[PDB]
């Protein structure tokens, strides 16, 4: 419907954090890759505080 | 007596096989040593079946 | 898109050449069990290929479904195609293999996909030792 406009609408919003994460951590290594991932967890939205709370759940271990 | 209790251990095996009990040689040795203490065997019949149930509970 | 799918066959080429040769007595008694728990995985590889072909016969396979299917087969077969070309290159006999597999089971401790696989490989290679 609507030539895949509505069907890929929901992924675009999520990609607008995943692209932010790869742009943001560029040129950072080490224990600052626990700081940069924690900083993006705090947004105010559950849709991106259940996505970076999973990336963070992997970087914890 | 050590001659006699090896032969009685061997004859004891056949009547545990043909009565279709779950015991093999190792469990037969465990059970003959356990009954030697003085435990009532009608009680042991339940703990062996409960072990064989809860073993299958894992797999 | 084909060159995205080609890494599966490239990560299959450097697996069977270990199993189908590097297991014999001259090579030690340690290349045996390495080719005795890498063979089960290659059996699994051929299992997956046959299960795909059956769907292809019913008109139910194209490049995209194949592309989704092979991401489990290039996140797992690539681990093997990395380990195999480092154990084979350089004489890894006895404890040197087991140090290399305590180095490449520490290379994955933050992935958690490949860590269990490396532990499985060295838990079969530790048995003759």
């Amino acid at each position: 419907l609507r030539r895949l406009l509505v069907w890929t609408y929901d992924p675009k919003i999520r990609l607008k954090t995943l692209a932010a994460l790869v742009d943001h951590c560029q040129g950072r290594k080490g224990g600052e890759l626990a700081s940069a991932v924690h900083a993006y967890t705090k947004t105010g939205d559950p849709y991106m505080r259940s996505l970076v709370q999973h990336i963070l759940s992997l970087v914890s271990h | 007596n050590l001659n006699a209790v090896r032969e009685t251990m061997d004859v004891l095996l056949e009547i545990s096989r043909i009565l279709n009990t779950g015991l093999d040689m190792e469990t037969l040795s465990i059970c003959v040593r356990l009954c030697e203490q003085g435990i009532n065997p009608e009680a042991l019949s339940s703990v062996i079946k409960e072990l064989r149930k809860a073993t299958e509970a894992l797999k | 898109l084909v060159h995205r799918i080609l890494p599966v066959a490239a990560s299959y080429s450097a697996v069977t050449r270990f199993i189908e040769e590097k297991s014999s007595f001259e090579y030690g008694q340690v290349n045996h069990a390495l080719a005795a728990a890498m063979r089960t995985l290659v059996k699994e590889h051929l299992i997956l290929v046959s299960q795909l072909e059956q769907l292809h016969r019913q008109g139910l396979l194209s490049l995209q479904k194949l592309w989704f299917y092979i991401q489990p087969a290039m996140r797992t077969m690539d681990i093997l195609a990395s380990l195999a070309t480092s154990v084979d290159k350089g004489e890894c006999l006895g404890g040197s293999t087991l140090s290399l597999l305590h180095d490449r089971s520490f290379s994955y401790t933050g992935d958690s996909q490949a860590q269990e696989l490396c532990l499985y490989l060295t838990k079969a290679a530790s048995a003759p030792y």
């Binding site: - | 009685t8 004859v11 004891l12 056949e14 009547i15 545990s16 043909i18 009565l19 279709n20 009990t21 779950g22 015991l23 190792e26 469990t27 465990i30 059970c31 003959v32 040593r33 356990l34 009954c35 203490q37 435990i39 009532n40 065997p41 009608e42 009680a43 042991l44 019949s45 339940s46 703990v47 062996i48 079946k49 409960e50 072990l51 064989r52 809860a54 073993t55 894992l58 | 699994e44 299992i47 997956l48 046959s50 299960q51 795909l52 059956q54 769907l55 299917y69 489990p72 087969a73 996140r75 797992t76 996909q113 490949a114 696989l117």
Partner: protein
């Protein structure tokens, strides 16, 4: 101790391939069932009562052997008392019956056609068993060749 032999019972009945937390729970299972019966006729007579059902189901020499062994074990009393309570829940030519060609002065009864027909059934059970193996080897593998891919392998979970 006696409570230590119950750990060895858990050791034989569960082999190792986790495997350090299951054995204490099975040890609990071994202890918890022993004392419920303790809160709440000879021995060889039950052997005869079980040899009877054998003879009802045919198979003569097996009953003749079961009675043969308890007769010489009376010529360990508490361990056969366990076997009669564990019965029937575990895992389980000759040319002198219907072949009268061998022997010395063989018994004269005329002929046979009524046990010679149950001498083919003695092989027919084997012929019916060794085809059930190949039914259960083609089935376990057609359960692999036909499925949606990777639902019998955890490789999709990698």
């Amino acid at each position: 101790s006696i409570t230590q032999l119950f750990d060895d019972l858990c050791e034989a009945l569960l082999p190792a391939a986790n495997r350090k937390r299951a054995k204490r729970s099975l040890k609990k299972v071994a202890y918890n069932a022993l004392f419920t019966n303790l809160f709440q006729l000879p021995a060889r007579n039950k052997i005869l009562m079980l040899s009877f059902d054998l003879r009802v189901g045919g198979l003569g020499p097996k009953a003749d052997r079961l009675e043969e062994l308890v007769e010489e074990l009376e010529a360990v009393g508490s361990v056969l008392d366990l076997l009669v309570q564990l019965a029937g829940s575990g895992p389980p030519r000759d040319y002198f019956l219907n072949n009268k060609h061998v022997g010395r002065n063989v018994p004269y009864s005329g002929y046979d056609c009524d046990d010679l027909s149950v001498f083919e059934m003695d092989v027919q059970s084997l012929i019916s068993r060794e085809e059930c193996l190949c039914h259960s080897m083609i089935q376990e593998t057609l359960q692999v060749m036909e499925a949606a891919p990777g639902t019998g392998l955890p490789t999709v979970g990698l």
